[PDB]
Amino acid sequence: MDKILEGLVSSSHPLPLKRVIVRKVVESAEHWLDEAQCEAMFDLTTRLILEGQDPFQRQVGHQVLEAYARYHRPEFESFFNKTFVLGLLHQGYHSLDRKDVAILDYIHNGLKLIMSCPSVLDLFSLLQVEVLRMVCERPEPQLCARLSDLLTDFVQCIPKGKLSITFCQQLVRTIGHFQCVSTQERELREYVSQVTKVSNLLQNIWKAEPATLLPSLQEVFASISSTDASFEPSVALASLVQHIPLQMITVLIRSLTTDPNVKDASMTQALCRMIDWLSWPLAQHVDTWVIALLKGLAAVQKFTILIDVTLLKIELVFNRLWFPLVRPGALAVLSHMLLSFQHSPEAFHLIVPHVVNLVHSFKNDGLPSSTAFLVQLTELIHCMMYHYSGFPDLYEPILEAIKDFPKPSEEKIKLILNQSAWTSHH
């Protein structure tokens, strides 16, 4: 039947005919077949899965392989052996390079098929070694996501003991290299979902083996605090930090800011990188980290860092307000920056030219959540215009745009502005 299936898939027969023939091929599995017959079908179906020209061909490969492996499990066990699996990982397959996602997908599928077979134990042991190698090699997000699906299904493939920590550290470093060169929106949604899978794997490892958590977070800190000019860590690291307990954030921020061996440059970088985490499409709780660090730095009087980074980043933070999921966090960061930067209008005047367009865009969108957001923003803006008064031409269009929102009392504004300032000239 392998010759028949082969002929069929390269034919131009109508689709319903192709399907009835494939059905008969699938049913052919339920017969006594010798070893050569089984191996010939496993070769062909593997070729169709990995090199099938279209979705139909690959699907047929999957259907036929499943049936043949189900009815001829010992022959599939001989076929899907350690040497073959290792070969796929190191040399790829026909036209496919070893890093192709289809390869890792086929291996995952194969593990499901041989999971009741004795050979599976040595495959797991083999894979624990190979998957650690794979993550050390800095794989692309799509491959790393597939790896994550595999390891979620088969936890026996995750490196164990001391190597579980090494694996997590290397996976953090790997995440730090993630990028998406495409600017097509479809690719970008896929990138984010891929990164989410990898992050989910790692969070699951933290739960299962708590000793991996701290070393993993330390690695995140080493990445973001790096002053290596040739490397910029990916904002994909933000996907890791959304569900870290508060106490743990405190330990990390405290160590970063009070350890006498940490250079000012490293702190500046950590703060710049954390603010950039606001760029991550699912950056809901980044503000918790950024504000902890802003406060941590003020406590050890790193006011020049605070001031310089604010001037560098405040436009980015303001622009994040356009993204509804990150907006409350971006507002919290913006508010802390503006209300702490009390010696010069420079930071506020960087955002001034963007206020009308934002306000105009949200005030008639019909959303009560937009209105409540604007009540908070306009309160903040009124405080800044009062504190940095004497620019009537600059402020007039803003005052017009915000005329229909509450204006805090002068008395309330003065109390708001009693916020701790960052000491200039320090």
Cβ nearer to Cl ion, comparing 50 with 385:
385
Cβ nearer to Cl ion, comparing 260 with 392:
392
Binding mask 381-410 for Cl ion (x = CB under 5 A): --------x--x--x---------------
Other beta carbons within 10 angstroms of residue 312's beta carbon come to 14
**Closest approach of Cβ 263 to Cl ion, in Å?**
41
Cβ nearer to Cl ion, comparing 4 with 399:
399
Cβ nearer to Cl ion, comparing 62 with 407:
407
Cβ nearer to Cl ion, comparing 99 with 387:
387
Binding mask 344-383 for Cl ion (x = CB under 5 A): ----------------------------------------
CA-based Rg of the chain, rounded to a whole angstrom? 29
Whether the CB-CB separation of 334 and 317 falls below 8 Å is answered with: yes
**Closest approach of Cβ 143 to Cl ion, in Å?**
56
Cβ nearer to Cl ion, comparing 56 with 395:
395
Number of residues that bind Cl ion (CB under 5 A): 3
Cβ nearer to Cl ion, comparing 326 with 347:
347
User: Which of 252, 244, 242, 255 lies closest to 283 in space, CA to CA?
Assistant: 242
**Closest approach of Cβ 399 to Cl ion, in Å?**
9
**Closest approach of Cβ 245 to Cl ion, in Å?**
45
- Rounded Cα distance, 408 and 339, in Å: 15
Exposure of 343 in the CB half-sphere (CA atoms within 13 A): 14
DSSP state for residue 177 in the 8-state scheme? T
**Closest approach of Cβ 362 to Cl ion, in Å?**
24
**Closest approach of Cβ 403 to Cl ion, in Å?**
15
Other beta carbons within 10 angstroms of residue 127's beta carbon come to 25
Binding mask 186-215 for Cl ion (x = CB under 5 A): ------------------------------
Cβ nearer to Cl ion, comparing 188 with 399:
399
159 Cβ neighbours under 8 A, 6+ residues apart: 128, 129, 131, 132, 166, 167
**Closest approach of Cβ 253 to Cl ion, in Å?**
37
- Rounded Cα distance, 130 and 228, in Å: 29
**Closest approach of Cβ 394 to Cl ion, in Å?**
8
**Closest approach of Cβ 352 to Cl ion, in Å?**
12
Q: How many residues does the chain have?
A: 426
Cβ nearer to Cl ion, comparing 395 with 405:
395
Long-range contact set of residues 325-330: C-beta below 8 Å, sequence gap at least 24: 325/281, 325/282, 325/283, 325/284, 326/278, 326/283, 326/284, 326/286, 327/373, 328/287, 328/373, 329/278, 329/283, 329/284, 329/285, 329/286, 329/287, 329/288, 330/278, 330/287
Whether the CB-CB separation of 124 and 93 falls below 8 Å is answered with: no
Helices and strands, number each (H, E), in the chain: 21, 0
Q: Give the 3-state secondary structure of residue 325.
A: coil
- Rounded Cα distance, 349 and 295, in Å: 23
Which chain residues interact with Cl ion by CB under 5 A? 389, 392, 395
